[PDB]
Design a protein around this ligand. Structure first.
Ligand SMILES: CC(C)CCn1c(=O)c(C2=NS(=O)(=O)c3cc(NS(C)(=O)=O)ccc3N2)c(O)n2ccnc12
Length: 551
């Protein structure tokens, strides 16, 4: 057996009671009426998740796999990475990151408290001196909001102690920030803003005489990741030009933490043991991207896919290539999938060839088209708004550590649903509470940012361009998917939201300075006669999911 996990039978436990039911307040019904459709995951379903993630991995590595790996290593040898000082790593820690078991917290770390710093120094020395003892991790059930499909079990998060997390940053922050783009070039997804990611997909689709594309979804990717895969990742990091002390900390973190280790619940009991990827380590995003790109690149070769271009964001993969005709394309995908499977990345849903760029979903998103003020066609990234709307509903009535509505407006600003619903609804709330000035935390590509809502128009201009404040004539397909999600969740129809936005718009103007700018730029779509809109950040460098990174 090469089992992903082994279990003692101790339960995965909560550390703060959990709500599964959508909380309701005086604002809820204005956004969403079918309250019973929205739920949060809790520890109560941890047992179901444990079954889905617990399986035997077999791997067969052929010449295609080793050929790609050697090329990846040749690129990695051009990378030079530096160690971060204690201070620099401390400043990357989120103010609300889980406190250490060793008598200090995240604010202690960020303040360079001598207790915190002395302890981090001691963890670092222990990594230099010991490269064998498994390091403790905590396993928790995540509380995430979804719409019924009817329920998903809680996903599991596994993370080491704060002092270890700081040490991870010291050894590897520079490496995981710089190495993936050097190794993968334009295939590394986390270097693009949503605008850049649309342009790379459109330009890639166009670069083909006869385009064919597909997303590839690996079933529980983290669980498919073997000890071979994690040591092979380490062998890639070790190609970089690194201080000897960083070489030794990386080796040590790989043997004692990345490859596996014991799982402790929130109550201090032993839950079992992990031999696969931990979700809550610095390297999760870079490790998964390298491993997915290596297997997928080797699988493309096996399948003889012609002129493929891949786009990789951790475990999310899309491939666009030169079509060999429909029958040949479909056979090719079967071979690609057989190869991914021998490599221990079996499919969740069989992949399917697509000849319409707009019908491919990757990173939960698809390209679509609207028209700018001039009336030119404009590509932009959108998504099904069901999950964004369910989570906005939760957030309307409860403070949560991440405001998904804010990350969503930023990332999907050009979209019909973020503009009409999310902007209108949350600006209305913030105005009534006089909180436009209040910085709020959100997550982009796994990193935490503290963003003042009043800064949105500058942020959105910077990332999307001015056209985001004037898109119109959305596609019937996009319009229809939005309207159908509104009906499903009991959200008022778009015509109601345009009326509310005129009010929100007027109220924002009633204030001047940054507030009027929000009114003027964010809600220009809502007036009959538009105003002239004229012009009024290491954000997309790398992904950091589970990496405890604050920017
Ligand atoms: C270009 C955007 C609009 C796509 C959608 N999108 C994401 O893909 C990520 C993103 N955030 S993410 O860094 O947590 C992540 C992780 C992984 N896989 S793993 C665990 O690293 O192996 C795959 C994809 C993602 N995508 C994100 O933070 N946000 C925010 C708003 N929209 C997005």
């Amino acid at each position: 057996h090469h089992m992903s996990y082994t279990w003692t039978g101790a339960l995965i436990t909560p550390c703060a009671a959990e709500e599964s039911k959508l909380p309701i307040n005086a604002l809820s019904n204005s956004l969403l009426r079918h309250h019973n459709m929205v739920y949060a995951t809790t520890s109560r379903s941890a047992g179901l998740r444990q079954k889905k993630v617990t399986f035997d991995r077999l791997q067969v590595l052929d010449d295609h796999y080793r050929d790609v790996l050697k090329e990846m290593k040749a690129k990695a040898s051009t990378v030079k990475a530096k160690l971060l000082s204690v201070e620099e790593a401390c400043k990357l820690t989120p103010p609300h990151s889980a406190k250490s078991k060793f008598g200090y917290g995240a604010k202690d770390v960020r303040n360079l408290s001598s207790k915190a710093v002395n302890h981090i120094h001691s963890v670092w020395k222990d990594l230099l001196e010991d490269t064998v003892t498994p390091i403790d991790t905590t396993i928790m059930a995540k509380n995430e909001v979804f719409c019924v499909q009817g329920r998903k079990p809680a996903r599991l998060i596994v993370f080491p102690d704060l002092g270890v997390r700081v040490c991870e940053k010291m050894a590897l922050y520079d490496v995981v920030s710089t190495l993936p783009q050097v190794v993968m070039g334009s295939s590394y997804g986390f270097q693009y803003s949503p605008g850049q990611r649309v342009e790379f997909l459109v330009n890639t689709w166009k670069s083909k005489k006869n385009p064919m594309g597909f997303s590839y979804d690996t079933r529980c990717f983290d669980s498919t990741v073997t000890e071979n895969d994690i040591r092979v990742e380490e062998s890639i990091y070790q190609c970089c030009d690194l201080a000897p002390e960083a070489r030794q900390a990386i080796k040590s973190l790989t043997e004692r933490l990345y490859i596996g280790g014991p799982l402790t619940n929130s109550k201090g009991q032993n839950c079992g043991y992990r031999r696969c990827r931990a979700s809550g380590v610095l390297t999760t995003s870079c490790g998964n991207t390298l491993t997915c790109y290596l297997k997928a690149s080797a699988a493309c070769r096996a399948a003889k896919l012609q002129d493929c271009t891949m786009l990789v964001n951790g475990d999310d993969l899309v491939v666009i290539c030169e079509s060999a005709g429909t029958q040949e394309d479909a056979a090719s995908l079967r071979v690609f999938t057989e190869a991914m499977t021998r490599y221990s990345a079996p499919p969740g849903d069989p992949p399917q060839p697509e000849y319409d760029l707009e019908l491919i979903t990757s990173c939960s998103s698809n390209v679509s088209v609207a028209h700018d003020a001039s009336g030119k066609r404009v590509y932009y990234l959108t998504r099904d708004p069901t999950t964004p709307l369910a989570r906005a509903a939760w957030e309307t009535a409860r403070h949560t550590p991440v405001n998904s509505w804010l990350g969503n407006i930023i990332m999907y600003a050009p979209t019909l649903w973020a503009r009409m619903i999310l902007m209108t609804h949350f600006f209305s709330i913030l105005l009534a509470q006089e909180q436009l000035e209040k910085a709020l935390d959100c997550q982009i590509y796994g990193a935490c940012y503290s963003i003042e809502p009043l800064d949105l128009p500058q942020i959105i201009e910077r990332l999307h361009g001015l056209s985001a404040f004037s898109l119109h004539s959305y596609s019937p397909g996009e319009i229809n998917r939005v309207a159908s999600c509104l009906r499903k969740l009991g959200v008022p129809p778009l015509r109601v939201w345009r009326h509310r936005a005129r009010s929100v718009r007027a109220r924002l103007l009633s204030q001047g300075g940054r507030a009027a700018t929000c009114g003027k730029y964010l809600f220009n779509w809502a007036v009959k006669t538009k105003l002239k809109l004229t012009p009024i950040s290491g954000w997309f460098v790398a992904g950091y999911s589970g990496g405890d990174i604050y920017h």
